[PDB]
């Protein structure tokens, strides 16, 4: 996955 941090 990509940058999935909120």
């Amino acid at each position: 996955a990509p940058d999935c941090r909120p």
Epitope: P2, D3, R5
Partner: single-chain antibody, 226 residues
């Protein structure tokens, strides 16, 4: 709230070098990956490079078109990201944007550089009126779009002003109006405007993730009449 301020563009010769800079404020820069994306009339919106976090050893990835010529770097103590561009070609001409966060909420104003395969498909144009519901779609040449493509939607208004709307398929970016929503419908990604407004006249781009790179669609010109 958030500002990404680019600099360093110009008018350069084929074969030359140039370094772009982007300074961030209003969010915790060091906690997010950063990207460079470029726009040209010929090749549309094109993802160029990403850089990850200190905890990832600042891992980088590049588009095949720039690999071995471009280098992305960051300085967390200055909240800045950079793009070193060597051996420039005519095809590198465009407006260069730094962008990131969930996954393309925030965009810089762009800096112009003038030098002198998966296909993601969107509707070329759609026409609506105020108060209507309009749905834009985003198809992959690879097959069905899934949540593993982390579909993003971004809006371009004059003059080359980008704002991210939706990331991770259906997550609305902070401060984005409630009339915008993301979905997956019939194995395409979709952006719906539930009650279109005159100010929503704009170009809308989708971006899909494939393992380690982004592919942007061609954009949809939405006209809002009446």
């Amino acid at each position: 709230q958030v500002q990404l301020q680019e600099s360093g563009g110009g008018l350069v010769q084929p074969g030359g070098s140039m370094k772009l800079s982007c300074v961030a404020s209003g969010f915790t820069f060091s906690n997010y990956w950063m990207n460079w994306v470029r726009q040209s009339p010929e090749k549309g919106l094109e993802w160029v490079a990403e850089i990850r976090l200190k905890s990832n050893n600042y891992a980088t990835h590049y588009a095949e078109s720039v690999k071995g010529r471009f280098t992305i770097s960051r300085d967390d103590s200055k909240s800045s990201v950079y793009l070193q561009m060597n051996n420039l070609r005519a095809e590198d001409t465009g407006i260069y944007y730094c962008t990131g966060v969930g996954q393309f909420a925030y965009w810089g104003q762009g800096t112009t550089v003038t030098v002198s395969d998966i296909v993601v498909t969107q509707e070329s144009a759609l026409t609506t009126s105020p108060g209507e519901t309009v749905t834009l779609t985003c198809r992959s040449s690879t097959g069905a779009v899934t949540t593993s493509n982390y579909a993003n939607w971004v809006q371009e208004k004059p003059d080359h002003l980008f704002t991210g709307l939706i990331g991770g398929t259906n997550n609305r970016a902070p401060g984005v109006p409630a009339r915008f929503s993301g979905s997956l419908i019939g194995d395409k990604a979709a952006l719906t405007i539930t009650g279109a407004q005159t100010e929503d006249e704009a170009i809308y781009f989708c971006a899909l993730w494939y393992s380690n790179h982004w592919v942007f669609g061609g954009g949809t010109k939405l006209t809002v009449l009446g």
